[PDB]
Amino acid sequence: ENVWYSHPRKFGKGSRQCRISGSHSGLIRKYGLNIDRQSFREKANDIGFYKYR
Amino acid sequence: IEDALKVVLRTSLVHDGLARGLRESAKALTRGEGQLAVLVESVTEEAISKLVQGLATENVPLIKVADAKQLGEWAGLGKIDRDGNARKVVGASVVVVKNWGADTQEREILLEHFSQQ
């Protein structure tokens, strides 16, 4: 409820936020994925990226 | 006896309109909001009761009578869980009904008996 609990979280690490764990380190924003690297590694074959070259 | 009591309390609970206590009751009274007020005839001081009556007079109608604890039980205050009561004890003090819900029964009959003889 507090109108003093949050300052601007506009960019960098604020709005630039994870879409799996809730982390902030290693954020591939390419094609608007917003996934962490490690998670992506174990999921990319389902999202559709592979090891062709 | 008294169909527009328990049922009315239930309706109030459904639609949020049991201004239970003093301050809440007063608030309900101040404008055309509180339709029916239930007080206790047998309480300490009685000055408070008189004040309540005055406020009502300033909608007016009041159902008097005693039996505070029973009224409290009817209205539902505390923890239910089972089917009935399951508390220590709770009185009525002053309860002002702001809602009505469904008609029929003795809704207007009790009122007629009281306000309009």
């Binding site: 409820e1 609990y5 879409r19 799996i20 809730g22 | 239930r10 609970l13 459904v14 949020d16």
Partner: protein, 96 residues
């Protein structure tokens, strides 16, 4: 958590109407979708509801996945009084 009662009631009603609740782990934020309340409160309410059976919970991709059992539904109805034969979507209506 202590939620303003009316808001809580509204939330409950919405849940009943749906049979499904979301609200992500996006705390602090102004307002949830569909229901016009602060999210934290909603989440807490949901958790409370779950605590005794009632609802289901999954934390997947920070989403929260809230759906009620029939007993839970009944309890919800009791909480908000509401007459017989008012349906979420567990009771089938369409054709597929």
């Amino acid at each position: 958590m202590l939620i303003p009662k009316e808001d809580r009631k509204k939330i409950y009603q919405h849940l009943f109407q749906e049979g499904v609740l979301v609200a992500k782990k996006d705390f602090n934020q102004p307002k949830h979708e569909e229901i016009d309340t602060k999210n934290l409160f909603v989440i807490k309410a949901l958790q409370s509801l779950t605590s005794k059976g009632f609802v289901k919970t999954q934390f997947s991709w920070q989403y929260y996945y809230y759906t009620l059992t029939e007993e839970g539904v009944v309890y919800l109805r009791e909480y908000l009084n509401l007459p017989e034969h008012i349906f979420p979507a567990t009771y089938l209506a369409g054709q597929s």
